[PDB]
Enzyme design. Sequence first.
Site, mmCIF file in Angstrom:
data_model
loop_
_atom_site.group_PDB
_atom_site.id
_atom_site.type_symbol
_atom_site.label_atom_id
_atom_site.label_comp_id
_atom_site.label_asym_id
_atom_site.label_seq_id
_atom_site.Cartn_x
_atom_site.Cartn_y
_atom_site.Cartn_z
ATOM 1 N N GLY A 44 5.716 1.501 -8.409
ATOM 2 C CA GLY A 44 4.364 1.831 -7.989
ATOM 3 C C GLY A 44 4.285 3.297 -7.593
ATOM 4 N NE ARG A 47 1.641 13.881 -8.647
ATOM 5 C CZ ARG A 47 2.859 14.121 -9.138
ATOM 6 N NH1 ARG A 47 3.063 14.226 -10.449
ATOM 7 N NH2 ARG A 47 3.883 14.264 -8.303
ATOM 8 C CD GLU A 128 18.752 -1.041 10.369
ATOM 9 O OE1 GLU A 128 19.561 -1.935 10.702
ATOM 10 O OE2 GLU A 128 18.229 -0.244 11.181
ATOM 11 C CB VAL A 131 14.161 2.303 13.879
ATOM 12 C CG1 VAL A 131 14.672 3.004 15.124
ATOM 13 C CG2 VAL A 131 12.747 1.798 14.088
ATOM 14 C CB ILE A 135 21.683 5.388 12.687
ATOM 15 C CG1 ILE A 135 21.891 6.889 12.496
ATOM 16 C CG2 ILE A 135 22.580 4.864 13.799
ATOM 17 C CD1 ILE A 135 21.339 7.721 13.634
ATOM 18 N N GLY A 186 13.155 24.427 6.670
ATOM 19 C CA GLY A 186 12.876 23.115 6.125
ATOM 20 C C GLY A 186 13.136 21.950 7.051
ATOM 21 C CG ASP A 200 9.098 10.109 14.084
ATOM 22 O OD1 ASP A 200 8.822 9.397 13.093
ATOM 23 O OD2 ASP A 200 10.270 10.315 14.471
ATOM 24 C CE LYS A 204 11.754 7.727 13.614
ATOM 25 N NZ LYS A 204 12.590 8.943 13.397
HETATM 26 N N1 NAP Z 1 11.338 10.729 4.270
HETATM 27 C C1 NAP Z 1 12.102 10.294 5.244
HETATM 28 O O1 NAP Z 1 13.052 10.951 5.686
HETATM 29 C C2 NAP Z 1 11.794 8.956 5.841
HETATM 30 C C3 NAP Z 1 12.564 8.487 6.896
HETATM 31 C C4 NAP Z 1 12.266 7.272 7.482
HETATM 32 C C5 NAP Z 1 11.203 6.539 7.013
HETATM 33 N N2 NAP Z 1 10.462 7.006 5.988
HETATM 34 C C6 NAP Z 1 9.246 6.227 5.478
HETATM 35 O O2 NAP Z 1 9.420 5.977 4.111
HETATM 36 C C7 NAP Z 1 8.123 5.887 3.480
HETATM 37 C C8 NAP Z 1 8.105 6.766 2.257
HETATM 38 O O3 NAP Z 1 8.273 8.139 2.674
HETATM 39 P P1 NAP Z 1 8.582 9.261 1.586
HETATM 40 O O4 NAP Z 1 9.153 10.439 2.272
HETATM 41 O O5 NAP Z 1 9.312 8.678 0.438
HETATM 42 O O6 NAP Z 1 7.099 9.620 1.112
HETATM 43 P P2 NAP Z 1 6.577 10.595 -0.034
HETATM 44 O O7 NAP Z 1 7.586 11.645 -0.299
HETATM 45 O O8 NAP Z 1 5.288 11.241 0.452
HETATM 46 O O9 NAP Z 1 6.275 9.646 -1.338
HETATM 47 C C9 NAP Z 1 5.359 8.542 -1.231
HETATM 48 C C10 NAP Z 1 5.337 7.823 -2.558
HETATM 49 O O10 NAP Z 1 4.393 6.730 -2.494
HETATM 50 C C11 NAP Z 1 3.392 6.879 -3.484
HETATM 51 N N3 NAP Z 1 2.115 6.476 -2.905
HETATM 52 C C12 NAP Z 1 1.515 6.985 -1.782
HETATM 53 N N4 NAP Z 1 0.375 6.415 -1.480
HETATM 54 C C13 NAP Z 1 0.207 5.462 -2.476
HETATM 55 C C14 NAP Z 1 -0.809 4.528 -2.730
HETATM 56 N N5 NAP Z 1 -1.891 4.379 -1.966
HETATM 57 N N6 NAP Z 1 -0.673 3.734 -3.816
HETATM 58 C C15 NAP Z 1 0.410 3.879 -4.585
HETATM 59 N N7 NAP Z 1 1.435 4.722 -4.442
HETATM 60 C C16 NAP Z 1 1.273 5.494 -3.359
HETATM 61 C C17 NAP Z 1 3.449 8.334 -3.937
HETATM 62 O O11 NAP Z 1 3.020 8.522 -5.301
HETATM 63 P P3 NAP Z 1 2.678 9.995 -5.841
HETATM 64 O O12 NAP Z 1 3.894 10.851 -5.850
HETATM 65 O O13 NAP Z 1 2.105 9.790 -7.233
HETATM 66 O O14 NAP Z 1 1.593 10.529 -4.910
HETATM 67 C C18 NAP Z 1 4.923 8.684 -3.752
HETATM 68 O O15 NAP Z 1 5.680 8.339 -4.909
HETATM 69 C C19 NAP Z 1 7.087 6.236 4.553
HETATM 70 O O16 NAP Z 1 6.506 5.054 5.095
HETATM 71 C C20 NAP Z 1 7.918 6.962 5.609
HETATM 72 O O17 NAP Z 1 7.380 6.788 6.915
HETATM 73 C C21 NAP Z 1 10.740 8.181 5.396
#
Ligand code: NAP
Lengths: 431, 427
Positions: A44, A47, A128, A131, A135, A186, A200, A204
């Site tokens: 899913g 784009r 898991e 949070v 870890i 970054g 954030d 958690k």
């Molecule tokens: N990044 C981290 O370090 C991290 C750590 C802990 C938890 N998380 C959690 O993991 C989740 C994903 O984070 P991420 O960093 O992978 O996010 P991301 O880089 O912003 O990517 C989100 C993905 O979901 C898709 N998407 C977003 N809204 C959508 C919708 N309404 N319908 C369908 N597809 C949709 C996007 O598609 P497009 O690319 O086409 O827009 C993209 O492929 C979040 O809930 C975040 O809180 C992330």
Amino acid sequence: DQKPIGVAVLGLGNVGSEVVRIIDESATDLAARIGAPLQLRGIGVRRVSADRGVPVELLTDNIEELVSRDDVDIVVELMGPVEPARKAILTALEQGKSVVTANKALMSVSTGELAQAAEAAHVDLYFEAAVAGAIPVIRPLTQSLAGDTVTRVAGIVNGTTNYILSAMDSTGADYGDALAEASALGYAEADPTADVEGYDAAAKAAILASIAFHTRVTADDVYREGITKVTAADFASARALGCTIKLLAICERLTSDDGHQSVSARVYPALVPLTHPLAAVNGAFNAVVVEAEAAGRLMFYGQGAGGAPTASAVMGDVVMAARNRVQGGRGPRESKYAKLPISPIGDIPTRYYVSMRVADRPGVLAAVATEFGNRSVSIAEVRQEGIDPRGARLVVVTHKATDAALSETVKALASLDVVQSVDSVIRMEGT
Amino acid sequence: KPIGVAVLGLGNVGSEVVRIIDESATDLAARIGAPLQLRGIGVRRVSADRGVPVELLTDNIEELVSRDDVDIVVELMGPVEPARKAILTALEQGKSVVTANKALMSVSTGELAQAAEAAHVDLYFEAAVAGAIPVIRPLTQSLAGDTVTRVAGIVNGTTNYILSAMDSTGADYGDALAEASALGYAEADPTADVEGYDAAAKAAILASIAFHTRVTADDVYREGITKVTAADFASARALGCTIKLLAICERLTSDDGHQSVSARVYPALVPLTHPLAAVNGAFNAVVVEAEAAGRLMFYGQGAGGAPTASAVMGDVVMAARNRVQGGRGPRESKYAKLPISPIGDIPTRYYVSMRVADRPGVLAAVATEFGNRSVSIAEVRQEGIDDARLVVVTHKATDAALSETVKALASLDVVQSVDSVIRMEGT
Ligand SMILES: NC(=O)c1ccc[n+]([C@@H]2O[C@H](COP(=O)([O-])OP(=O)(O)OC[C@H]3O[C@@H](n4cnc5c(N)ncnc54)[C@H](OP(=O)(O)O)[C@@H]3O)[C@@H](O)[C@H]2O)c1
Ligand SMILES: NC(=O)c1ccc[n+]([C@@H]2O[C@H](COP(=O)([O-])OP(=O)(O)OC[C@H]3O[C@@H](n4cnc5c(N)ncnc54)[C@H](OP(=O)(O)O)[C@@H]3O)[C@@H](O)[C@H]2O)c1
């Protein structure tokens, strides 16, 4: 007869990209550990393009169709937004699909409705990755410590704020220069508000408190204070007092004099003594301290953010969910049996560091001392010296007392004539 | 319906287990979904002076594990053969088993796990490794979707308390070991600890859990701390190090792609800045390196009756939950069939302290011996004794080459004696 287990991954961003890469590159190990092949059915996304490291025929923007396919067994929610996330999670559970997610904000707001839905459909719901990134924290608190009594969960659960504070502690940089460097390298984002203000961390903390004490706690129950008021002067005073400063998430099982139990969940800057384990956690790493009665003190350290470490946690949940479907029988079940009341911040026993500018007269210390004592607050340490023939710098560290009493003491000190200003107020933990 | 518990064994762990089943009855029942009721306690000497109601005590272990109103058998007896017997009988009677026996799990997991999988029943053993630190469940479930490459750290509380004491006070090995035994941190016969059997069994379990292959105690290199002296800690401090009993478990990959596993426990100089250098007293610490997850560290108490009871009870709640909700735990996965890498092949570094002739030529002789086996030296220190002391620290090299050099040094004329040889890790 080993029927393959189908997987639908929602999202192909930082985490989802890594999850799909692993399902590909480790398919042999994954299959061998699950008991059956783990086959990706679709991805899913919003784009759809051929420039996303995957064949386009896998990409779809119809999420409801992807989680509804019959050859799909597990749905991995790794999209950002919470309303699309909840809609996908629910429709998938309703159809008997195990769900793995990493959505902090969704879980911190209500695991009640989603857990009930997974129980109804007789299927798993694992989060898991929500949070502590890689870890393992949720599985240890729900399973390994299920025979014990957890009393305190405390640690560093936000990498950005720990990198900024670690940097201010090393280089004596001002908050602004440290945040700038953080953004440039970054570690922080263009709008770091969710971090530096503690949102954030609070989410958690709600999840950790709920898991640790078997009660429902939501992000709205967590007292939140960020790091934007932390200065380089604060770190100098902290060092002089044998401490560093950290943005802590704290979850405590409290007991009142009348015997009743309650739960506290709070995030705020805290002076932490250099001897404490959390003081040695620097950079963007995370660490979680768990106090239990039989086990004592445990600490879990690692990376609590990033695509690769978060994916590690997702994939652990995926393998478990696939294993459960192969062998039948689910995993754990939501344990919110305690129904503990929530203690607001004012009832919590803590300690205050207070830095003031005061008149350089020999009676001012007696005045502030009376203001602390008149509310039954005892003083542990005091440091007073002049500034350059004008005034004096007065630092005060209290012993433990309710945040209420210390908050009212601060308000009082501000209104005193001998007190020119209250420049800093920071809680103190560890000790 | 209630869930029946039978605790085989009393003492440090068994006493705490029973006490928790009684004092935490309400929470345990509400976390399982059904009451948790103790049916009997297996023991050898039945008497009324054992801090527990006598009616519960029984010396017929086979009868206790076979009762219908039992459901989980908590094996907490010492010896391996009575343990294996009771475990097998309990599993064959359709009873979930929770154990803490390091030696039983490290010698043969094959038959026991197969017997448990056949009877559609659990066989949990978290308490076997790292006392209260949850380590086995993370490696079997949380990291199951990852590729672990290294697991290493401090996994023995007794040895770690002795060494920490030797580092803090400058005490000799004999005095520290006596302090430990007296204060209850060691035991009457601490051989299992001080010679490395405890650590080596735990390392076998860690490697097999992390690399999804069978690794037994017979495959783990084992060296203890009995030859660690106060003069060793004096040199280590001088070299910016401490000393620790390290267990190391590595997934090794060759240039052609051949995978193998190495599991080894020995003393090691570790730099004071290393994280393991801050793990003191009876605490333990386990470091896990994985491809996606990166580096993790688990810290806590690794020895004690209450900490170990905490792990046991974690497994008991899960085994009781499973029996209520009709399920099981992760099947044993030892599919990789990786070959075992011996020690000679492993790269490491040596600290070698010798007494040599007090003439200006000895250093060139020792150096050539190191060099002729293609070993570079990283640091040397030489001074005279009062009626010459030569200390050498090498760069990385195979254990086999370093062993050959040590032998050559002992046979050298200028070398009066090789007084200490300790590996050096971390760095
Ligand atoms: N990044 C981290 O370090 C991290 C750590 C802990 C938890 N998380 C959690 O993991 C989740 C994903 O984070 P991420 O960093 O992978 O996010 P991301 O880089 O912003 O990517 C989100 C993905 O979901 C898709 N998407 C977003 N809204 C959508 C919708 N309404 N319908 C369908 N597809 C949709 C996007 O598609 P497009 O690319 O086409 O827009 C993209 O492929 C979040 O809930 C975040 O809180 C992330
Ligand atoms: N102690 C720790 O800190 C610790 C930590 C981690 C793991 N463990 C593991 O936990 C297990 C128990 O250790 P422990 O320290 O509790 O041992 P312990 O103090 O020596 O107690 C052993 C118990 O087992 C009983 N027992 C011994 N042989 C028996 C037999 N043949 N048949 C029936 N009962 C028998 C003994 O009964 P009697 O008193 O009548 O002889 C005694 O109650 C071991 O596998 C150990 O490796 C221990």
